[PDB]
Design a protein around this nucleic acid. Structure first.
Lengths: 64, 75, 136, 116, 50
RNA sequence: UCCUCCUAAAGAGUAACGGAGGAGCACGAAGGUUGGCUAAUCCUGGUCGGACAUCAGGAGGUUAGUGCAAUGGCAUAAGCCAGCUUGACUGCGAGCGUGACGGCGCGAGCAGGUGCGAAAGCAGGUCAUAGUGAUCCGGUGGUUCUGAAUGGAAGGGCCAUC
């Protein structure tokens, strides 16, 4: 049978032109009053997946 | 009733005398001001010293209290 | 039983006894007992030596003690496994390096001084020698 | 001590101008003969000075050490600085409150070309 | 943590708001800081609210 | 779990059921700026008043203080007082520090619009280092971004926040 994509992974990573992956930062959901605007502002833009965990991401979504 | 400790903050001098640095690079990480900002050097809110211009970093002693200063010369 | 008062900390590290003695000269009396060996003296040993000389001199002259314990030593209770924290303080010891002057004395004849110090040294765990105050 | 208090007062400003690295107009005030000087950023040389202590400027005003004297010195430094070439400067109170003679000197200087 | 969180609502029609904390026990009256509203790009009065 | 010192061997880091202590906050001011001021402890005189209230002078130079444990720092004061204020602002951010990663920290400078000052200038919270919890699910406000025949709506997405 063909490989099954990890659906949870497919909802959090998007593939880019050079084979990288972009993901949303993981600290901007709640408990935001006590956070400085500088830290919230920097977490807004999407970021690239690090090299160390890139191999893990490749296995999770081999098709996308 | 002991056994508690805090994660080390990795303070200390990051750039030493006589080596070129880029603008905005951290030179010294410190709790207080062991070294005071000199020329082309800025002091952060946590007393971090960073380069405000590109050049060579040097240390010197100045003032009536012989307190240490960090400067940058455009070389 | 010499012992400090309200020390900053109850326990301290074992450390090491390397190095060389500092108080190597007679400063108060005319005769003294110099330490030849290296080791530590407990408070009990210092008291025992002091009592021996005072009796020997028959409360004549002056006695100076140039060493203070100021160092707690712990000891685990019998039938106690290793670990579970530092042991409780038991006795205080003074680290002695070669050349250290232990006791000083004055106001007695040299002949009587020699036997008095010899009796004291017999109750100490370190090799000792008799010294006399030097002129400069 | 009056001097010690004054130096302590002006130390922060002097250090701020020194690190900023800009020519500064420094004024010294006394019961008579208000002085004024222009200092290079390095602080080692004086570009130009003026005051009411010299006969060249003290031969007109009735009395030295008043509002009129400050305006004359403040004006006097102006054309000298403009003639020299330097235009922008930083005013230094030197621990003197910016209220009376000091203000008059600065007001005369700024309206005479030395805007700051 | 007696200090509790409030919402500062711009006096302008825009829905933008700030969030902060205050102590109702000591300072029960409303808060009327003057802050910057980016929707209208002007400084306006902000009123305290839930 | 987090913070400070020592262990830790003069860069960083470094274990033990090793030795000492703290935090799960507080503050619309204790924040910003402008102006001004400089302690502890002693000696002498003086009603209650007395070793220790307040006043005057002298030695002293920070042994004081710094909202909270400790370390480092602090006279240009970061310590103390007063006026005016909301920069405890929005969109960014060269370049660095720190982590396996998630992440965390510092930051000149640019645009917009503000506060203090005559001005140069300072201000993107607090002398710094603890005061904190990922994702999922769901709530509240804004935004035709989407909205499975069409026009709407429901529901999702994005932004702010619980």
């Amino acid at each position: 049978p063909k490989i099954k994509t990890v659906r949870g992974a497919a909802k959090r990573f998007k593939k880019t032109g050079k084979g990288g992956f972009k993901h949303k930062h993981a600290n901007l959901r709640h408990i935001l009053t006590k956070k400085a605007t500088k830290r919230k502002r920097h977490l807004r833009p999407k970021a690239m997946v690090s090299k160390g965990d890139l191999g893990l991401v490749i296995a999770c979504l081999p098709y996308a | 009733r002991n056994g508690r400790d805090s994660e080390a903050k990795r303070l200390g001098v990051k750039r030493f005398g006589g080596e070129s640095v880029l603008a905005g690079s951290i030179i010294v990480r410190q709790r207080g001001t062991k070294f005071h900002a000199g020329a082309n050097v800025g002091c952060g809110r946590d007393h971090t010293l960073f380069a405000k211009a590109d050049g060579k970093v040097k240390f010197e002693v100045k003032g009536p209290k012989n307190r240490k200063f960090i400067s940058i010369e455009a070389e | 039983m010499l012992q400090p008062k309200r020390t900053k900390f109850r326990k301290m590290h074992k450390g090491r006894n390397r190095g060389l003695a500092q108080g190597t000269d007679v400063s108060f009396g005319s005769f003294g007992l110099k330490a030849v060996g290296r080791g530590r003296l407990t408070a009990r040993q210092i008291e025992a030596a002091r009592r021996a000389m005072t009796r020997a001199v028959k409360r004549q002259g002056k006695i100076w003690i140039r060493v203070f314990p100021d160092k707690p030593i712990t000891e685990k209770p019998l039938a106690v496994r290793m670990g579970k924290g530092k042991g409780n303080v038991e006795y205080w010891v003074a680290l002695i390096q070669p050349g250290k002057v232990l006791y000083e004395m004055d106001g007695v004849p040299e002949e009587l001084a020699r036997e008095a110090f010899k009796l004291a040294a017999a109750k100490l765990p370190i090799k000792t020698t008799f010294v006399t105050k030097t002129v400069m | 001590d009056k001097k010690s208090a004054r130096i302590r007062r002006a130390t922060r400003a002097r250090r701020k101008l020194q690190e900023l690295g800009a020519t500064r107009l420094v004024v010294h005030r006394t019961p008579r003969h208000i002085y004024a000087q222009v200092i290079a950023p390095n602080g080692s040389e004086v570009l130009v000075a003026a005051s009411t202590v010299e006969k060249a400027i003290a031969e007109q005003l009735k009395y030295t050490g008043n509002k009129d004297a400050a305006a004359a010195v403040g004006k006097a430094v102006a054309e000298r600085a403009l003639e020299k070439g330097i235009k922008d400067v930083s005013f230094d109170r030197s621990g003197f409150q910016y209220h009376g003679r000091v203000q008059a000197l600065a007001d005369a200087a700024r309206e005479a070309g030395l805007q700051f | 943590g007696i200090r509790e969180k409030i919402k500062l609502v711009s006096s302008a029609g825009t829905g933008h708001f700030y969030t902060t904390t205050k102590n109702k026990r000591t300072k029960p009256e409303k808060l009327e800081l003057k802050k910057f509203d980016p929707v209208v790009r002007q400084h306006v009065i902000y009123k305290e609210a839930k």
